[PDB]
Design a protein around this nucleic acid. Structure first.
Lengths: 86, 85
RNA sequence: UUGUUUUGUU
């Protein structure tokens, strides 16, 4: 079943596409939303995103593999990934 | 004398001229700047603007009549209008 | 500047 995950510590230069290539190693991805500050031109990434997988299996596999495990280029802390508050 | 108002919650299809049509009901309008994302092409509207009235009586009447009162067509919120920073 | 977006103030 689909579950929406919060991901943080992503570099501001990464787009939905860059991130999709990241998470798809773990399972199909239904939707990626980079959180942006719409006051910028163009809107800046806030360094985090929302990602929904088609299955809870994929989302777990990813959380295991990434959360506190992997540090993205130029970042200073490892990915934070967990069920989004929503 | 000239008072500059920020106005938010405006449809991205509206241009300076549509906005001037709206504010000019309340008094003479000196200038309107639609805030645009010039990185876009065409540059894209950010859905807010600055509008400058020649007199504060017009700006306060527009503000009173619009801020939180009118919802422009297609919007999910009422116009936000206050004196610009 | 660990951030859970759509309120946007050139």
């Amino acid at each position: 079943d689909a579950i929406k995950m919060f991901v943080g510590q992503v570099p501001r230069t990464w787009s939905e596409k860059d991130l999709r290539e990241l998470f798809e190693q773990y399972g199909a991805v239904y939707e990626i939303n980079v959180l942006r500050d719409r006051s910028q031109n163009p809107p800046q990434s806030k360094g985090c995103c929302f990602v929904t997988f088609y299955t809870r299996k994929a989302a777990l596999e990813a959380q295991n593999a990434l959360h506190n495990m992997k540090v993205l280029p130029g970042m200073h802390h490892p990915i934070q990934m967990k069920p989004a508050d929503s």
